[PDB]
Give the backbone structure.
Amino acid sequence: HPLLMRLLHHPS
Amino acid sequence: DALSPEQLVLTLLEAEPPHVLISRPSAPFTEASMMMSLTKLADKELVHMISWAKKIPGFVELSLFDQVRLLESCWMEVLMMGLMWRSIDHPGKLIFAPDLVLDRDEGKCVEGILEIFDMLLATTSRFRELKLQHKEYLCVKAMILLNSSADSSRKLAHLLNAVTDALVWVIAKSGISSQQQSMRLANLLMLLSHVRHASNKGMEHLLNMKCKNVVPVYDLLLEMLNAH
Ligand SMILES: C[C@]12CC[C@@H]3c4ccc(O)cc4CC[C@H]3[C@@H]1CC[C@@H]2O
């Protein structure tokens, strides 16, 4: 789940 | 207080993702280009769904494990719930985006999708018949996320309870009898089985389109789909 975890932790 | 029914509804209202503006191809739809339009849209909406979920009070406080599995479990259904709301006042049509409006019969160009379109339209029509309100829609969509799939399970149950309490409160604003508020509540929740059913068929159909190489899928949609 790398992209999901990034988007859960990175704001944008 | 951040989770009073009124405050919670307002937070969900402000949390709504923006309109994903996408257009039709200049050319008429083929199997390939319809699927490319729909998957491109879905991926973009997947990006915005994660941001939406992070704005639901207490969602980021959940375990990272729970945040992942809830979004993984519910995303297609939430996507479909969004579509039906956008399409509620437009019989015979699916308003995928403001500039991407498909008639029922246009699903004939993609193999297997027409049956799913009919499920989506049929379920949308029941929601129109019930006169689904925007604030009822907001609570229900949040309930799909939170009811999908130690201290985190308690926080999840509590958060699910608060959104449910908010829906009961929205329904109670109509000033109908306590009998009729219960009937309306049941009627709305019973329709979610049909949305879930449509999402399971949509998932299956998308998996088949990917394996048969009818369309390439990328980014977040690909990842969610590889995960199952
Ligand atoms: C998942 C599919 C592509 C993406 C479609 C979509 C795309 C965006 C959206 O908001 C809702 C839906 C529901 C129907 C979905 C389709 C049903 C079958 C198809 O494979």
